[PDB]
Ligand binder design. Sequence first.
Ligand SMILES: Nc1ncnc2c1ncn2[C@@H]1O[C@H](COP(=O)(O)OP(=O)(O)OP(=O)(O)O)[C@@H](O)[C@H]1O
Ligand SMILES: Nc1ncnc2c1ncn2[C@@H]1O[C@H](COP(=O)(O)OP(=O)(O)OP(=O)(O)O)[C@@H](O)[C@H]1O
Ligand SMILES: [Mg+2]
Ligand SMILES: [Mg+2]
Lengths: 551, 551
Amino acid sequence: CFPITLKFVDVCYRVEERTILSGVTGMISPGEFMAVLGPSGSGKSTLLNAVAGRLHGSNLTGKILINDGKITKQTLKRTGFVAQDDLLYPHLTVRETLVFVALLRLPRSLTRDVKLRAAESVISELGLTKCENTVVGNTFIRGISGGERKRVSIAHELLINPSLLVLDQPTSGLDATAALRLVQTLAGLAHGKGKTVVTSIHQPSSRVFQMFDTVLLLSEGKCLFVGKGRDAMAYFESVGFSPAFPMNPADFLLDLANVRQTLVTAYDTLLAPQVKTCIEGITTCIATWFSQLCILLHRLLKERRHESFDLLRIFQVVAASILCGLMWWHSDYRDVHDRLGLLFFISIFWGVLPSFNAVFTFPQERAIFTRERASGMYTLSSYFMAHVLGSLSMELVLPASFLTFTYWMVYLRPGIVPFLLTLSVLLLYVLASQGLGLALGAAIMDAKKASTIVTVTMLAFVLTGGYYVNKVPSGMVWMKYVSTTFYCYRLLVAIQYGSGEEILRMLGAGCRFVEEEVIGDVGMWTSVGVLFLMFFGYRVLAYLALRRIKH
Amino acid sequence: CFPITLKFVDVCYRVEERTILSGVTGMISPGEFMAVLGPSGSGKSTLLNAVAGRLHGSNLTGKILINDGKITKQTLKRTGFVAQDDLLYPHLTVRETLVFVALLRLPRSLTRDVKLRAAESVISELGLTKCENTVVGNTFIRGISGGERKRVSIAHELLINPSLLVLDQPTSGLDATAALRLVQTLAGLAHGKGKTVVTSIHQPSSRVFQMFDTVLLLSEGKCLFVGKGRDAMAYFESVGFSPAFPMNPADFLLDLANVRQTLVTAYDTLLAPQVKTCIEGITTCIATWFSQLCILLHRLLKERRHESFDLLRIFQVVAASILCGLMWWHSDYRDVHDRLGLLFFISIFWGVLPSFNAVFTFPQERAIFTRERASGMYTLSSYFMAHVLGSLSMELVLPASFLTFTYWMVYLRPGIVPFLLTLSVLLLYVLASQGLGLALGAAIMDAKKASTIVTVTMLAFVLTGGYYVNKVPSGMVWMKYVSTTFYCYRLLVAIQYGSGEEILRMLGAGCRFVEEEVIGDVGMWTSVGVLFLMFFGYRVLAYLALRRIKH
Ligand SMILES: Nc1ncnc2c1ncn2[C@@H]1O[C@H](COP(=O)(O)OP(=O)(O)OP(=O)(O)O)[C@@H](O)[C@H]1O
Ligand SMILES: Nc1ncnc2c1ncn2[C@@H]1O[C@H](COP(=O)(O)OP(=O)(O)OP(=O)(O)O)[C@@H](O)[C@H]1O
Ligand SMILES: [Mg+2]
Ligand SMILES: [Mg+2]
């Protein structure tokens, strides 16, 4: 195994400017059980958060050390953290969640059956058998109780067996017997494997307290006692405070922490020097990536079973296509002005809808993305590829259904080849718009601040598309080459009306209008290549934005 | 005070089809303390919700009675329910939240100072003085700890002094001293005022257990013991179960609840018949409404001061206006085709933006709206008026800033009268679009499907705006009068270019074009009246949708 020793010296926290912690010092060796006790608001989820490395900035003072070294990402890979909040996927069951975690983080030198057995044994040990076939749920949908979600979160980190384990009040919400059994399991995990377990209990009983190895006492940002658990009562008796009647020691510790100045001075004069002196190949990556991508795809699809399946989308897009076809019923080839508006409207529709839809993806899952990123479940590239692969399963269906009706109701230029070319061009444009929407949604954390920005950006793209204005100023004409709607409209008009040499045949001012609204100054291959470039670049920018966010 | 006798008889709950509760009978008299004890997953919280009237449907059997009568809304007005989850406004402080509650619910016959004193005394009693000047926060922003949020939620209902008080594990997350103080406060509130208090503790100490009047024991959906707390040990000693060593009685109760069949049979044979036999002016409303509206407005603006105060919105709207003005730089009055498109684009912009920005208002606050509505803090009409009044403070600024630049960069028809008329028309149109967006967002409380539905509806409105198609089918002409963009565009063109008599001096095919795209078949007054009608109707439909949702 990998031993870990943990040290924190003169750690103080200042944010008004109030002090949350000050003058806390201590260590925990491997194979030692650490408790962080204190009254409510004394500071118990901030020391552990800083211990786990989840806190940064200039508000942190003192020195924190792991193996006489600074906190590193490789060290953080072996750290398990169980916080108070239960950030769980609502549409999965307990079995699926724990099996996914076990497949993801267990070593890749064992068969599937061994990992499944490990997950099942972990489920059975924690007493989760009864509700192992139920939806986890969340605050909105009806799922499991609050006492089982804590055990699920416990098993989320216990499945991997991290060398360093930090728990943030894991016994809150369970009865005496269940909490005692969980504490006994933690004690067996700490003593029987030489690991480093730090926990912050709040309401411990005498039986639970008796098996605790070391206890730290915090009183509103000040340390009061540290060392062996059995010596707390003796030390406080020697300092001048004695129980009037026999009672549980932890209650006395909390009462003393809840007079305070004398205890602080006595501790600072007695235990300060003793504590201050005692302290001094390549194919494997490919295989793992593909397996992880498969697992992520399965999880994403399982989540999307009850969300992505929406008959309303098809029943509305079909109605919109029928309305569009009826409005342009059998318009002939002669009126080029009437049929040029239909292509621009199609471009507006399929540049507005996917871009607006794609902005809701990353911010929706932001709540659990940080939680899964902090532990180090998988590299962000696998998640990005999983998302882009999952989206395309449903996204591409709508434009096909739209065109299948619109192209034949309006009776555009007959031919299978123009049909296929137009469909491919429209799908590429939709992909580019979705990529732009995803990038803009990833750039800004909130899902609603980015909504207005996306709306204004795509409306500016529509304005620059070239259909509205004709007398563009000479010095402000370059913006036409940036908008994604321009290339799609040019490709559609070039496909439908060729190069314009045919149009002048029937027509024999009109020639200038046809020349300016048909030929243009951009080629087909250039338009396709630039569309592909935009589709690559938007995903690249979204990946960079996702890389930027790290706590 | 108003006494309440609470009864539940043969309450069973069945949802796979797995039973959560079955054979639960009992009663609590005024001035009596009720406990719901049991292991994790025993269904105590479901029973607590059922007794509080928060559960409906055919899944509930048995009979529930209050004062020998069914649960009514007037009775629900006297009930204070606190659950495990803490639904609090993240951008408010403790003082502001509790003061708002005290002003909203305390009787309208006392001075402001008395209510403020009640709030301050409640704050001081619960030990919240130290952090009473901090932001409450949520999972995203840094606020108060999890141990103080529970006390805030407890005070949220303690400020009212309801006759019936139901608590769902209120002591989870606090130390021994804080838990003891809260339990003593609850005991004094129950015995000293003749109230009806039902709670479900999970990890009680002997001292806490000794002051509990009555205790009910649940074992995975089955009752095990009910009656006085002091007789809990004697009954199980008589039935044939005795602890080997002296220990806390609640631990023994949980162990027995955690063998089970014999206890169930003994309880069904012994204590069943005994319990079964024991079971058997006008101006005031106006004055209050305006004050409630004032408080709601203050809370809304306090919340929006940290979110709606975005300079990006103006910095982007002014940029879009500058781009629009540069695109149409000093276009003369001769080209009607180049100038009608600008008005249509303005209509598209100011229909798309507010409608899409008004779809997330209600779903965002849905999380707390149900919690506030269940208690009965205020009528829905006050909340609706508060929301519509708060929105207009910020919404109306954007169109004015847009027009101030666009109308004079393009140099439209000079004159203060056309400027004011078109500004009023644009403001009415943006209000109507915002109303439509609000109604659609209220109809479906999800922010995912509503966005797509609103986008498709607005795109259909744009298509039916009348700028794209010219050969409309005879049987496809009525829905022109349904879209709001049609009225907005007609008003804009009528204001800018008059009745068309003016255009024909220069006009002299073109005459038909001017007649069809200038005069139309709808009047100015009709357009304004129909716009006002739509503005009223959308808010009416939104109010109906908000009224519909009741758990
Ligand atoms: N719709 C459902 N279908 C199936 N099982 C359900 C359903 N809703 C709840 N359950 C299960 O029924 C049991 C009832 O739990 P409940 O929500 O009443 O919490 P509780 O008993 O108060 O527990 P705790 O003390 O651990 O918070 C749980 O095991 C829960 O997972
Ligand atoms: N940014 C901040 N500014 C001011 N005060 C803060 C800030 N963040 C936290 N606090 C306060 O500092 C104190 C430290 O609380 P902390 O987050 O450590 O919880 P805790 O002691 O583990 O709580 P509990 O044991 O009651 O669950 C709390 O009173 C909290 O409200
Ligand atoms: Mg904490
Ligand atoms: Mg519960």
